[PDB]
Design an enzyme around this catalytic site. Sequence first.
Site, mmCIF file in Angstrom:
data_model
loop_
_atom_site.group_PDB
_atom_site.id
_atom_site.type_symbol
_atom_site.label_atom_id
_atom_site.label_comp_id
_atom_site.label_asym_id
_atom_site.label_seq_id
_atom_site.Cartn_x
_atom_site.Cartn_y
_atom_site.Cartn_z
ATOM 1 N N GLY A 98 38.057 25.622 -29.691
ATOM 2 C CA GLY A 98 37.530 26.646 -30.575
ATOM 3 C C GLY A 98 36.338 26.263 -31.438
ATOM 4 C CB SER A 99 33.073 27.974 -31.794
ATOM 5 O OG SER A 99 31.781 27.395 -31.834
ATOM 6 C CB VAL A 100 35.514 25.773 -36.619
ATOM 7 C CG1 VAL A 100 35.880 26.062 -38.094
ATOM 8 C CG2 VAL A 100 36.743 25.815 -35.732
ATOM 9 C CB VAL A 155 32.772 23.660 -40.454
ATOM 10 C CG1 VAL A 155 33.869 24.369 -39.690
ATOM 11 C CG2 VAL A 155 33.355 22.561 -41.321
ATOM 12 N N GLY A 156 31.816 22.274 -37.201
ATOM 13 C CA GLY A 156 32.394 21.596 -36.064
ATOM 14 C C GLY A 156 32.760 22.594 -34.985
ATOM 15 C CB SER A 157 32.885 23.681 -32.287
ATOM 16 O OG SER A 157 32.658 23.175 -30.984
ATOM 17 N N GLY A 158 35.500 22.701 -31.037
ATOM 18 C CA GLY A 158 36.197 21.912 -30.043
ATOM 19 C C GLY A 158 36.137 22.607 -28.703
ATOM 20 C CG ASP A 210 44.912 20.210 -35.011
ATOM 21 O OD1 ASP A 210 44.176 19.229 -35.295
ATOM 22 O OD2 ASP A 210 44.481 21.295 -34.565
HETATM 23 N N1 LIG Z 1 37.415 22.965 -41.736
HETATM 24 C C1 LIG Z 1 38.515 23.465 -41.244
HETATM 25 N N2 LIG Z 1 39.406 23.909 -42.119
HETATM 26 C C2 LIG Z 1 40.564 24.432 -41.646
HETATM 27 C C3 LIG Z 1 40.837 24.507 -40.252
HETATM 28 C C4 LIG Z 1 39.798 23.998 -39.369
HETATM 29 C C5 LIG Z 1 39.953 24.012 -37.918
HETATM 30 C C6 LIG Z 1 40.530 25.099 -37.048
HETATM 31 C C7 LIG Z 1 41.134 26.346 -37.390
HETATM 32 C C8 LIG Z 1 42.542 26.570 -37.273
HETATM 33 C C9 LIG Z 1 43.106 27.825 -37.610
HETATM 34 C C10 LIG Z 1 42.269 28.878 -38.069
HETATM 35 F F1 LIG Z 1 42.809 30.088 -38.388
HETATM 36 C C11 LIG Z 1 40.873 28.679 -38.194
HETATM 37 C C12 LIG Z 1 40.313 27.431 -37.859
HETATM 38 N N3 LIG Z 1 40.287 24.786 -35.702
HETATM 39 C C13 LIG Z 1 39.607 23.614 -35.818
HETATM 40 N N4 LIG Z 1 39.323 23.030 -37.046
HETATM 41 C C14 LIG Z 1 38.412 21.828 -37.309
HETATM 42 C C15 LIG Z 1 37.395 21.545 -36.169
HETATM 43 C C16 LIG Z 1 36.169 22.462 -36.064
HETATM 44 C C17 LIG Z 1 36.003 21.029 -36.547
HETATM 45 N N5 LIG Z 1 38.647 23.482 -39.920
#
Ligand SMILES: Nc1nccc(-c2c(-c3ccc(F)cc3)ncn2CC2CC2)n1
EC number: 2.7.11.24
Length: 351
Positions: A33-35, A27-30, A165
């Site tokens: 962090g990989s998500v 669902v993306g990543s940065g 964030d």
């Molecule tokens: N879809 C979605 N929903 C919610 C949080 C996030 C999230 C978290 C993130 C932050 C805290 C966590 F515990 C887990 C993941 N870190 C990044 N993203 C979005 C980025 C990956 C695309 N993404």
Amino acid sequence: ERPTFYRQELNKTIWEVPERYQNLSPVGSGAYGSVCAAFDTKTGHRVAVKKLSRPFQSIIHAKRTYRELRLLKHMKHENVIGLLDVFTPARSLEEFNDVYLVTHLMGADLNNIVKCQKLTDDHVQFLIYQILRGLKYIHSADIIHRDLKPSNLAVNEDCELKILDFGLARHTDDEMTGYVATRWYRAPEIMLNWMHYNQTVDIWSVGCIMAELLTGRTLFPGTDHIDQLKLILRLVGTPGAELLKKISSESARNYIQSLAQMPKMNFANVFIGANPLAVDLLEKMLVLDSDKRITAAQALAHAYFAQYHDPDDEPVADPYDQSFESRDLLIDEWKSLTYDEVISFVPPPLD
Ligand SMILES: Nc1nccc(-c2c(-c3ccc(F)cc3)ncn2CC2CC2)n1
């Protein structure tokens, strides 16, 4: 005795997660962090699981990792991002190296709502109310977000908002350059580092968001730091001696004194057609002197949120011990504090 984990490679990344997490899908990543998205069979929620990249490759990363876990472990407000679970496949500190964080999966953010047009006053009311309610909570624990902007506000189909964030930990340099949304919501004092910034830098951010929700346009879309500072002063007026005195850099003060002075503009003539209460509130938030800006707690009390304000339902946080921020430790020392924090995690109850 931990749960059973199951390995699995997704998009060139190995993910070792407990069985409760099923149907994992990127669902993306940065660079942070990989998500993956997934269904958590224990709660019934769809969750977002993030596998931190190199949590302990450096003291700064080890510390940032530590700081993020403490921060996420502490936040327990419905308008602030919470930690559903945190885990590591590691059987011991000896092998501890991976940190996975779990939270509610969020669909859209505030952009996927503002960017569509101006919003109804009732929606701006509700959305801003929620931002301030969570901010009151965040600030009560002496935490400064530092990066409030639409892309950091999760919003669901029922206009329910969550702040995520958290700034602290990330340092977006060379990303604040040019015509970037990342800088448009930043308080002038933090944007040009005029002085040491307080919690109201976040209130300035709410102001820019509120305005944008009302007009449907970014309030200060500067093409750079100076262009943006000019847009701000044009509306808010150039600084006075009181404020000038507070700017710690003789250069900043010198620069500022080079600008032709300007009075504060008429906000009703700027936000044409807006509920006068919204305009009033915007004037209390968009104050150049951070010292005279309105607080989250005070804003909630403003008459613009009369429809939603309930003093008995706008909680504050438990004390937040940030003494570690001064602590000078080794990578391995942060790693072990981090491991304790993982190990000690207590999940929020269900029902
Ligand atoms: N879809 C979605 N929903 C919610 C949080 C996030 C999230 C978290 C993130 C932050 C805290 C966590 F515990 C887990 C993941 N870190 C990044 N993203 C979005 C980025 C990956 C695309 N993404």
